[PDB]
C-alpha cells in the first residue's frame, strides 16, 4: 500500500552517507594538494639552485682568466 515510506528511509540513509564519502574524498584531495604544493615550490628551489650554481661556476672560472 505504502512501500514508498519504507523506501524513503532507505534512500535517506543513502544520501547522508554520500555526504561522508565525498567530504572524505575532498579531505583526501586537500591532503594530496598540500604535498604537491610543496613539491612544486621545492622544484622551483632546485631550478634557481641549479641556476645559482651555474653562475657561481662561471664566476669561479671567469675570475681565473681575468688576471693572466
Amino acid at each position: 500500500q505504502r512501500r514508498a515510506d519504507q523506501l524513503a528511509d532507505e534512500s535517506l540513509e543513502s544520501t547522508r552517507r554520500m555526504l561522508q564519502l565525498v567530504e572524505e574524498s575532498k579531505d583526501a584531495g586537500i591532503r594530496t594538494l598540500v604535498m604537491l604544493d610543496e613539491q612544486g615550490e621545492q622544484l622551483d628551489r632546485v631550478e634557481e639552485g641549479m641556476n645559482h650554481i651555474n653562475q657561481d661556476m662561471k664566476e669561479a672560472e671567469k675570475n681565473l682568466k681575468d688576471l693572466g
Binding site: A8, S11, L12, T15, R16, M18, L19, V22, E23, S25, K26, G29, T32, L33, L36, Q39, G40, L43, D44, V46, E47, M50, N51, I53, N54, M57, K58, A60, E61
Partner: protein, 60 residues
C-alpha cells in the same frame, strides 16, 4: 514536524562537492604536467653543470 527537506539539501551538496572534486583533480593534472616538464628542465641544467665541473677540475 518537518517537510522532509534533508534529501534535497544533501543531494545538492553531493553534486556540489563532486563538482569541486572534478575541478580539483584536473588542477593536479596541470601541476603534474608542468612539474614533469620542470624535472626534465632541471635534468638539462644538471648535465650542463656537470660539464662545467668536469671541465673545471680537468683544466689541462
Amino acid at each position: 514536524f518537518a517537510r522532509e527537506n534533508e534529501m534535497d539539501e544533501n543531494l545538492e551538496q553531493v553534486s556540489g562537492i563532486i563538482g569541486n572534486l572534478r575541478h580539483m583533480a584536473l588542477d593536479m593534472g596541470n601541476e603534474i604536467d608542468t612539474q614533469n616538464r620542470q624535472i626534465d628542465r632541471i635534468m638539462e641544467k644538471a648535465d650542463s653543470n656537470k660539464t662545467r665541473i668536469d671541465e673545471a677540475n680537468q683544466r689541462a
